[PDB]
Design a protein around this nucleic acid. Structure first.
Length: 190
RNA sequence: GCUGAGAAGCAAAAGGAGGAAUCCGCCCGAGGAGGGGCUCGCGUCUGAUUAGCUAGUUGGUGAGGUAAUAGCUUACCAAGGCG
């Protein structure tokens, strides 16, 4: 498999470099988007997928220099996933990729807008308060305030996870505007 | 590069965008185009019921000054200069 990277190195311009790859964007959708241009032997996505979201830097490797020139030209201004990818050239591409794909497959745990992100919670707001909110509304899994690490005041940020996607949607829509005491909270699915 | 006969000395910099590639820059020079600053020949209204004017005035040197020549400015010398 390191054969694919070494083959590309040897060729010289099988290389094409992909910048601002989205958060949902994956080795397979990189391959599908770029295989139209020509037969990709290999595709490299860097591992920032702790969660779904990506590093937004990757490599693709062609059979030919010419396919790589065509993909560099055509792909730039391509929307994937709501974010737009430039293909200028890369260094001769680097397909650890098998390791990354395995970690990506493992790493992704959370699927679908099932968690709610809290914006604006006032500094008085307690972890228990968030439990009260989340439990009062549609039925509930867990509650967190993101508190300052340096020393540990709320910094007013925080999360729910609910038991259903529907409860997430209702909490987002019902809440946003929301006073909780002293300050106007915004909640989105994340 | 500059000052100076040479001797000698003196003088500059800035990072930013981008994964890179590179691009926009910055500092010191050398040209060019264009834009300016000066100088001069010639042309540029009437009145003699206005006939003398001009003393930094017109020259010269020295010292300064200007982006640059220059009474541009100043001290001294010459008495010029316009009609």
């Amino acid at each position: 498999s390191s054969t694919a990277s070494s083959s590309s190195d040897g060729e010289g311009a099988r290389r094409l470099y992909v910048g601002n790859i989205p958060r949902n964007l994956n080795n397979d959708e990189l391959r599908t988007i770029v295989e139209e241009h020509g037969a990709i032997e290999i595709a490299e996505v860097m591992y920032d997928k702790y969660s779904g979201r990506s590093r937004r830097f990757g490599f693709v490797t062609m059979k030919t220099v010419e396919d790589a020139n065509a993909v560099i030209e055509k792909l730039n201004d391509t929307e994937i996933g709501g974010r737009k990818i430039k293909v200028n050239i890369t260094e001769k591409p680097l397909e650890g990729m098998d390791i990354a794909t395995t970690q990506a497959e493992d790493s992704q745990f959370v699927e679908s807008p099932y968690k709610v992100y809290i914006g604006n919670l006032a500094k008085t707001v307690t972890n228990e308060l968030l439990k009260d909110f989340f439990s009062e509304k549609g039925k509930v899994l867990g509650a967190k305030v993101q508190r300052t690490p340096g020393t540990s005041k709320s910094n007013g940020f925080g999360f729910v996870s609910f038991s259903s996607e529907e409860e997430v949607e209702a909490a987002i829509q019902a809440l946003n505007n929301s006073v909780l005491e002293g300050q106007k909270i915004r909640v989105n699915k994340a």
